[PDB]
C-alpha cells in the first residue's frame, strides 16, 4: 500500500525549561526579626 497524497500537519509540543528562581533567607523566615531567636538559630549551626 503506497500513499498517493500527503498532508503537512503542524503539531505544537510544549516543554518546561525553567522554574522561578526563588530564594529563602533563614533569619527573616525562621525568626520574626527578633534577636533572641537569632541567638538560638546561630546556636543550631550551619543549616542556613
Amino acid at each position: 500500500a503506497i500513499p498517493t497524497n500527503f498532508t503537512i500537519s503542524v503539531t505544537t509540543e510544549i516543554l518546561p525549561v525553567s522554574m522561578t528562581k526563588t530564594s529563602v533567607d533563614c533569619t527573616m523566615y525562621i525568626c520574626g526579626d527578633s534577636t533572641e531567636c537569632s541567638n538560638l538559630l546561630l546556636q543550631y549551626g550551619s543549616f542556613c
Partner: protein, 48 residues
C-alpha cells in the same frame, strides 16, 4: 567596644594572624558569609 561578629583566622603556629569584620564593608560581609578570604568572581548574597 561594639557588639560585632568577627571571623578570626588562626595560623599554623596557633595565634590569630588576620581577621575580618562582618559589618565593615559588604566585601567583608561576603568573606564573613563564604567563611574564607578567597572570594572569587561572581555575585554573592550575604544578608538583607
Amino acid at each position: 567596644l561594639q557588639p560585632r561578629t568577627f571571623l578570626l583566622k588562626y595560623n599554623e603556629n596557633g595565634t590569630i594572624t588576620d581577621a575580618v569584620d562582618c559589618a565593615l564593608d559588604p566585601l567583608s560581609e561576603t568573606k564573613c558569609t563564604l567563611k574564607s578570604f578567597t572570594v572569587e568572581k561572581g555575585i554573592y548574597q550575604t544578608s538583607n
